[PDB]
């Protein structure tokens, strides 16, 4: 049944190398949903962080439309191996390294709805670049992003839009996943830019990372403040008490050195 449907679609003259038709010659609108699973290996030296995520794309290809709402055919059919459909040449502008997961079956899912709507889901492991600034160490805040755009097709052919409902979905325990930071807000914005080759539509999900101030407080700031205060009480001691003032002065300084290390 399902295999018979897929066959009927690709028996006709179909070319996955050809952009899907549009009602008014406009661009193909790809609706994008993003699922963030893990954030890990944040590096301030190499200005990068590792993120694993599930990408969900959706567009309309009237060539793949095989049915109406009120027919005996299944609403959507899972695309089997050996059949290629046109897919957005989407990529990640700020990705330095990236892998797909291929253990057993590769982790992709393609659904072809009856009206011709295509759902594309894929698990991706990224290592994105994230320039960080530590002038306010450790009470600083960092913002890392995941840019998403098309490589070959310009604005006349493809246009990216964040999904209307819940564009970004974090995993259950993502905020606690980070040892160093605590993410307060995530945002989905557009980063469409004009380049020398043309105007390319682009999406940008941004995560904001704040560092834990509580540690540094009780590990550095609080003990050092008390240390400076202790150094003062040598002033209230008499001059003749050499063992008292010499000890306090040296002891306090030696302890401070240990703190810095």
């Amino acid at each position, epitope marked *: 049944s399902d295999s018979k449907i897929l066959a009927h679609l690709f028996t006709s003259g179909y070319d996955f190398r050809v952009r899907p038709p549009t*009602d*008014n010659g406009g*661009p193909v609108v790809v609706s994008v949903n993003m699922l963030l699973r893990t954030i890990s290996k944040i590096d301030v030296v190499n200005m990068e962080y590792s993120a694993q995520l599930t990408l969900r794309e959706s567009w309309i290809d009237k060539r793949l439309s095989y049915g109406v709402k009120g027919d005996g055919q299944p609403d959507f059919v899972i695309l089997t191996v050996g059949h290629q459909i046109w897919m957005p040449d989407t990529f990640f502008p700020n990705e330095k390294q990236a892998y797909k997961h291929t253990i057993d079956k590769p982790n992709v899912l393609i659904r072809i709805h009856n009206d011709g709507t295509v759902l594309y889901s894929v698990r991706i492991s990224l290592v994105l670049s994230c320039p960080m600034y530590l002038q306010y160490y450790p009470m600083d805040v960092q913002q890392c992003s995941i840019d998403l755009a098309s490589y070959a097709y*310009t604005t006349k052919d493809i246009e990216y839009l964040w999904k209307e409902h819940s564009p970004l979905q974090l995993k259950v325990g993502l905020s606690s996943s980070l040892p160093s930071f605590q993410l307060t807000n995530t945002s989905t914005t557009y980063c469409t*830019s004009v380049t020398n080759t043309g105007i390319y539509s682009c999406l940008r999900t941004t995560i904001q990372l704040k560092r834990e101030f509580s540690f540094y407080l009780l590990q550095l700031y609080i003990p050092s403040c008390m240390l400076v205060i202790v150094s003062w009480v040598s002033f209230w001691f008499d001059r003749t008490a050499i063992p008292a003032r010499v000890t306090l002065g040296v002891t306090t300084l030696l302890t401070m050195t240990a703190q810095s290390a």
Partner: antibody, heavy 122, light 110 residues
Framework: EVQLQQSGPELVRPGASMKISCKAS????????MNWVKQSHGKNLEWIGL????????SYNQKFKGKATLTVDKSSSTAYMELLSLTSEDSAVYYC???????????????WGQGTTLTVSS | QAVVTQESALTTSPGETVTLTCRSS?????????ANWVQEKPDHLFTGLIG???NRAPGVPARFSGSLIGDKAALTITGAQTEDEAIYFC?????????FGGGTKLTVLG
């Protein structure tokens, strides 16, 4: 505040060619792309092209491919528009309109210039 | 290739609410048309109002608000003022380029 001061009004003869300036001030110039809009009497507003001061990249309207040429001098924070092979049809008022987003194309008009009236007639 | 149609001119009184529309010839005005609204004061003054996805020009009063009523773009002024009297142009993004409309001459009776 920001300002977009353009060149003064000009009068030329058909066949010749001139260039309108648009000096920017009050913001980081390389961060916002500039549009150019043509306002004629006979026809409505005809949008020309846009140019990214940073990239140097340009994208013109198909109607004005070759008619206009957008350049940019980052040092003086100025956008230029050269009109070639001027005819009676090119008689209009030209504005430069800034895009609104910082180092990204937001597709929306922010600030405009005071306008430059170009009259060409034999 | 495409014609953008606006109202010839509209009249409103201070304090009331007026809505300017912007119809497309290619069909319904979607989000990829990036409806832009430009205000033209007399003496060739041009201010930006509402653009792209949900953007607003710096300093634009709260009374100005964009929407997609029906199958066309809309510019609604809730609580009109005397200084809101100008010519309002609508621009739509078809494919690679923008196309302006005829412009609506809004008159606020002082």
């Amino acid at each position: 505040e920001v300002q977009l001061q353009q060149s003064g009004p000009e009068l030329v003869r058909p066949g010749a060619s001139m260039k309108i300036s648009c000096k920017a001030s009050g913001y980081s110039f390389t961060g916002y792309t500039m549009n150019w809009v043509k306002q004629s009497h006979g026809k409505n507003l005809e949008w020309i092209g846009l140019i990214n001061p940073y990239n140097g990249g340009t994208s013109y309207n198909q109607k004005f491919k070759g008619k206009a040429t957008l350049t940019v001098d980052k040092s003086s924070s100025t956008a230029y528009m050269e009109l070639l092979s001027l005819t009676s049809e090119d008689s209009a008022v030209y504005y430069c309109a800034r895009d609104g987003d910082y180092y990204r194309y937001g597709r929306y008009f922010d600030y405009w210039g005071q306008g430059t009236t170009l009259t060409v007639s034999s | 290739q495409a014609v953008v149609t606006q109202e010839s001119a509209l009249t409103t009184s201070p304090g009331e609410t007026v809505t300017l529309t912007c119809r497309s010839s290619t069909g319904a005005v979607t989000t990829i048309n990036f409806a832009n609204w430009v205000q033209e004061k007399p003496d060739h003054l041009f201010t930006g109002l509402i653009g792209g996805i949900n953007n607003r020009a710096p300093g634009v009063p709260a009374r100005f608000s964009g929407s997609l009523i029906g199958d066309k773009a809309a510019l609604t002024i809730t609580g009109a003022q005397t200084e809101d009297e100008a010519i309002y142009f609508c621009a739509l993004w078809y494919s690679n380029h923008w196309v302006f409309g005829g412009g609506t001459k809004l008159t606020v009776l002082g």
